[PDB]
Amino acid sequence: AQNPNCNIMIFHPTKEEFNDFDKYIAYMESQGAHRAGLAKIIPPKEWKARETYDNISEILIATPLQQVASGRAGVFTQYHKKKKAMTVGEYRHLANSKKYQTPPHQNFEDLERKYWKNRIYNSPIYGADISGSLFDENTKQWNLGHLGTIQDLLEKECGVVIEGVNTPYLYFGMWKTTFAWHTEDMDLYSINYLHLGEPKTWYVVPPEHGQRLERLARELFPGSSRGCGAFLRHKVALISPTVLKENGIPFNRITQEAGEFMVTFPYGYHAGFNHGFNCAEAINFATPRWIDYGKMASQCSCGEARVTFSMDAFVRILQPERYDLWK
Ligand SMILES: Cc1cc2nc[nH]c2cc1C
Ligand SMILES: O=C(O)CNC(=O)C(=O)O
Ligand code: NI
Ligand SMILES: [Zn+2]
C-alpha cells in the first residue's frame, strides 16, 4: 500500500501533466495521496490563474462574518455574527488595521503558536462562501470554474440524471480567520486555490481514522453531540493540535501559500486558519471513488446545517432511506 503513514504529499506537475485534471487526481491517488486526506499541488511555473489581481477591490462581501469564540484555547466553538456589507477593498483595509493585522512573528511555527494561544480572545471577520470565480476564462488548466460537475459524474457512473449545479466560492480572510473541523458536503472532494495574500495553515485527519476524530469531538462537545448525531456538519468546532496529540488522534498539518492548490479527499476531516489578508477559491468535485463515500456520509437532521439545493439530489439518490426519513 502506498503512503501507509498517511503523510500529506506535495506534487509538482509539469505543464504537460497539468492538462488532464481527472487523470492527475487519479495519479495522485495511485501514489497514495488520498490516505492523508489532503494534498498540495504546486502548479507548473508557466501557469497563471489570471494576469493580475489589480481590479478586485470592487467585489462585494455582502455578509461578512465575525467569528466569535467560546470555550478554552485548545477546545472551542465559534459562531458567526453577520456584519454590514463591505467591498474587498474595505475588507483589505480592515484586515491590515492595527486591531486585526497579523502580529510580529519569527516564522510559520511561531505564528501557529500565537494562533492557538490567542485565537479565542479575538473575533476576526471572514468573507465566506461568496459565489464567484477569479480564474480568467482563458485559463484552460485547473480552472475551478470549468471543472466537470458532480451531477455529470453521478450520471456517468450511475446512469441517473439529476437537477443541480456546481460552482465555485470565494473566501476573503484575515489573521485568525478560522475554518472549523469538517468534511465536505456528502463527503465530496474539495479543491482550494490560494489566489493571493498571506498563507493558510491546514490540519487534517486521515480518512481511515475519521471516526477517531468523531469520537473525540463527542467527548469534547458533549451537549452538541446529544443535540445532533452529526454536529461537525455545523462547522463550528475547533480542537487544537496539542489536544489532538494529547488524545492520540492521528493528524497532519501543512501551510498553503499563494499560488498553490490544496485538494481534500473524501471523508478527510480538516480545519485551519489564515495568516493574514488573503483570497481563496474553492469548489467541491467528485470522482468514481467518491461514490461509496457519498453513500456513507453522515447527515445533520437537527436542522442547523445548511443543505443546498444541489445536495438534495445527492441524498435522494445515494441515501434514499435518509431522504425518506427527512420527508
Ligand atoms: C472509516 C470510515 C468511516 C466513515 N464514516 C462515514 N464515512 C466513512 C468512511 C470511512 C472510510
Ligand atoms: O479556506 C477555507 O476557509 C475553508 N476551505 C475548505 O474547507 C475547503 O477548501 O475544503
Ligand atoms: Ni472544506
Ligand atoms: Zn445538526
Swiss-Prot record:
The keyword Ubl conjugation applies. Its main location: nucleus. Zn(2+) binds at residues 228, 234, 300, 302. Fe cation binds at residues 182, 184, 270. The keyword Metal-binding applies. It comes from Homo sapiens. Histone demethylase that specifically demethylates 'Lys-9' of histone H3, thereby playing a central role in histone code. Does not demethylate histone H3 'Lys-4', H3 'Lys-27', H3 'Lys-36' nor H4 'Lys-20'. Demethylates both di- and trimethylated H3 'Lys-9' residue, while it has no activity on monomethylated residues. Demethylation of Lys residue generates formaldehyde and succinate. Belongs to the JHDM3 histone demethylase family. Binds 1 Fe(2+) ion per subunit. This is Lysine-specific demethylase 4D. The chain holds residues 11 to 337 of 523 of the full protein. One of its GO terms (cellular component) is nucleus. It catalyses: N(6),N(6),N(6)-trimethyl-L-lysyl(9)-[histone H3] + 2 2-oxoglutarate + 2 O2 = N(6)-methyl-L-lysyl(9)-[histone H3] + 2 formaldehyde + 2 succinate + 2 CO2. The modification PolyADP-ribosyl glutamic acid is found at residues 16-17.
